Design a protein around this ligand. Structure first.
Ligand SMILES: Nc1ncnc2[nH]cnc12
Ligand SMILES: Nc1ncnc2[nH]cnc12
Lengths: 504, 504
């Protein structure tokens, strides 16, 4: 009929008047042959494969106990609450503190993914998006700061490391010291570190108080399968009954329809696994509720019955303190976070330049203004309370549908503006819904393990120690250090002595 | 000179009179073109790459607490010793029991690797050797029986599972039900199960009471790096001082010269890593001694000062009890050990037949009499107290030097006879010397991970859950079950319903 004919000739005309206006001259839409309409399809598919890190990042930096401390705890029958009693849960005053910080990290992630993505398109003309990157969320929140105020480094110092690393990554890039520096790292340590982070981030998404709750303590094997139904109220311990938890099996169904959606190539599928096992866990009354009948849960439901809200940052705003940079374990956390960002935004940003055909004999057309926008956005992301940004590989779903200019990245920046207003629906995602989303990240990073040269022995001993010691010793710093230490001693003690025997 | 000329013409004549005697007619040395001398070189290189499993198997089945029970414990100030006080160490009576069982498992491994290897050559004419296979040592000793009498299944029942699995693997092979049965298992579950066993067997060789002592307990992260120097006398706990254990750093030096020996292609190298960090840990006086000044250690040194001994099996001889086969977790241990032997001796025994050129369009010349000798040897190995046998992949070092007949496997059977008489030197290998040997096994099994199809999603979700849940939940049964359960639900719920929609 002429109904679709009246629909098709308008899209032949709306794509002309955009290119005949001024906005086609800035983004250069005449060359880089494309139209206005197929840029909008390139940014819709980029956002849906990227919309999961708006909730994963909030539910993983609220476990850090961001600004809640011992002073704003509750009052009990004693004269004063002691040290470790408040920060392990079951409190009227501390749990209402941490419900006002997760509302300040959903807004602070959209405002960090706006500025990173909206400044990528306007300054570099490149079709990809930015957000706080996955992989360095778990290093700061679980290994530097730790689960609810553990560890040694406070959260105010951890947001000062991101500034001083962010300013160290502009002025190692503006001088030209990148190809001199990144090629110094060998291929096997660079490639096996991305596998071990994928196994650390999935062992996070299995524990009792972190994600679903499979693994647990044991007094002779040091880890065992619990999955227990009736557990301890105060702490997490198995009282009895294995594999019959209604919060465990509802999370497995979310893990299947995420994986049954990735095959058959549904673009956004990790967002539909989160929405399905959340929309069951909102009905009051069941055993899988996030809304119980406690006074600690009536305040979340009375905020849920309104579906939109304009919420402002008020707790985890600019909070920096350089008054702790004169001890030892601050700089070790500095040299680790400088290491994992140098290898994250180097192998990705050039690989996403050869898809779509930007590249010539080196030096694609947005080289110099993409290393700095990816670096300055960690500085503006550190004042707002979140971690470093990274150019996402999910942005490839927009490279395979015809996005080639910077109008892709501006529209991606405008869905994050249209998703900070839905704050009452995003703070209320349960921690067993975000569990399988931390496991499918580990599936997609282990897919690079078929490029490690397992033929030679020195390349396989170095790659095995780095992969193994990251999820076991519960440390990312103990896999980077114990990989370089094996790679030198197997190599320096015969080759370097042999070169120094012949160079003189 | 004529000195080597007088050496070379004798080896031209000694190789003739062996082939002109009757012993060249049985093994058929005229065809399969080879001589007597280069068979002896093929069996020397086969033994040295196989001599490590004479000490690893004894030091991993003595941690099981094989026949030592609560009745032959010591006597203390109380009227009777309680249950868990004896079996956790620090006892005059229980520790002298377990020093008489490790002397009955060094002899029982050589007598099991004799009969398996000496009957492979005489009945099948194939050049490889047999011993109790690595991979099923840790399943029985740490996961069925457990560390020193833990768990539910006693050791007398675990040696009855090996009989009833051994007799079930003759009469699934003699009827012809192997190609019908083994091809039913898909490729990804078959291939990823061999990677997760390699990561379970290496997490064993890092713990505080098992191997060296890196990982340890923690009350908030459930695993942490201890490596602590001054520990608890009774139990294992970190009192203070990280990374300064003299038993930790002596084990790292053994891990380097094992790995520095595998590259540059030294044939036996895992045996020279064990001998070097043992021969330092025999000098009385140091901090790394295996011979302290206790009465529990004077009895090991007074047995060490003699260097040869004829020792007889007296504790872990024929000990079978079918009086526990009417409960649940016995058969689950049966179907796991039947699973891992079906996939171990199928992908190996055909791969070791295409090297050396035995094969034609299927059906190499020792098909039917090698599935049964590999199966009947687990029956005769179960009466003597050790686990199932397997055709070793280290036997390939003899396939690449010209071994093609059964005289290779007979001579391998005669080095194990000449290494049961050195029992006082083999019981005295410390548990931190056997530690890195359990880690280089995990390096050599992870080298098959570059053949898993990480392209498709169903092949990568199934392979990731199987690899991850074996070293974490400390279970081999929880990786086989949780791999099939993901592989059906991603596949049966759309394909099988679609086939049943079209078949009718
Ligand atoms: N840190 C990161 N770098 C690149 N792509 C990512 N996708 C998710 N996290 C990422
Ligand atoms: N179980 C096993 N099967 C084959 N080769 C092996 N090498 C060591 N253990 C083995």
């Amino acid at each position: 009929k002429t109904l679709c004919k009246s629909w098709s000739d308008m899209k032949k005309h709306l794509n002309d008047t955009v290119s005949k206006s001024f906005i086609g001259r800035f983004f250069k839409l005449e060359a880089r042959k494309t139209t206005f309409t197929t840029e909008l399809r390139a940014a819709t598919a980029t956002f849906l494969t990227m919309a999961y890190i708006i909730t994963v990042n909030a539910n993983i930096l609220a476990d850090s106990g961001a600004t809640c401390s011992i002073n704003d705890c509750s009052t009990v029958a004693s004269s004063s609450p002691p040290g470790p009693e408040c920060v392990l849960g079951s409190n009227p005053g501390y749990e209402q503190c941490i419900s006002r910080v997760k509302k300040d990290l959903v807004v602070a992630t959209s405002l960090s993914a706006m500025v990173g993505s909206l400044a990528m398109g306007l300054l570099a003309n490149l079709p990809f998006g930015l957000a706080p990157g996955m992989g360095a969320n778990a290093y700061i929140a679980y290994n530097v700061v730790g689960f609810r105020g553990s560890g040694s480094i406070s959260y105010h110092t951890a947001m000062a490391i991101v500034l001083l690393e962010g300013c160290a990554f502009l002025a190692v890039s503006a001088l030209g010291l990148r190809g001199k520096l990144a090629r110094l790292i060998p291929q096997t340590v660079r490639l096996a570190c991305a596998v071990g982070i994928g196994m650390f981030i999935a062992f996070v998404g299995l524990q009792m108080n972190q994600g679903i709750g499979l693994v647990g303590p044991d007094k002779s094997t040091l880890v065992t399968l619990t999955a227990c139904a009736e557990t301890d109220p105060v702490t997490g311990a198995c009282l009895g009954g294995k594999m019959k938890s209604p919060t465990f099996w509802l999370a497995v169904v979310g893990f299947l329809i995420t994986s049954f959606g990735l095959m058959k190539n549904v673009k956004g599928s990790m967002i539909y696994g989160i929405v399905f096992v959340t929309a069951i866990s909102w009905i009051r009354g069941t055993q899988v509720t996030i809304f119980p009948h406690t006074p600690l849960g009536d305040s979340n439901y009375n905020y849920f019955t309104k579906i939109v809200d304009f919420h402002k940052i008020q707790s985890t705003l600019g909070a920096i303190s350089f008054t702790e940079f004169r001890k030892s374990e601050v700089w070790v956390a500095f040299a680790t976070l400088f290491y994992v960002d140098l290898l994250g935004t180097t192998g990705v940003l050039y690989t996403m330049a050869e898809i779509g055909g930007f590249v010539e004999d080196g030096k694609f057309e947005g080289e110099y203004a993409a290393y700095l926008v990816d670096a300055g956005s960690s500085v503006v992301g550190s004042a707002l309370g979140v971690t470093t940004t990274a150019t996402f590989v999910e942005s490839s779903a927009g490279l395979k549908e015809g996005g080639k200019t910077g109008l892709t990245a501006v529209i991606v920046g405008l869905y994050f503006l249209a998703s900070m207003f839905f704050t009452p629906l995003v703070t209320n995602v349960p921690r067993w819904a975000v569990g399988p989303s931390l496991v499918m990240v580990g599936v997609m990073m282990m897919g690079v393990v078929k490029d490690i040269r397992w033929g030679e022995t020195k390349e396989a001993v170095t790659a095995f120690v780095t992969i193994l010691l990251m999820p076991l010793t519960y440390s990312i710093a103990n896999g980077i250090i114990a990989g370089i230490g094996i790679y030198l001693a197997l190599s320096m003690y015969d080759v370097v002595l042999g070169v120094a025997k012949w160079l003189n």
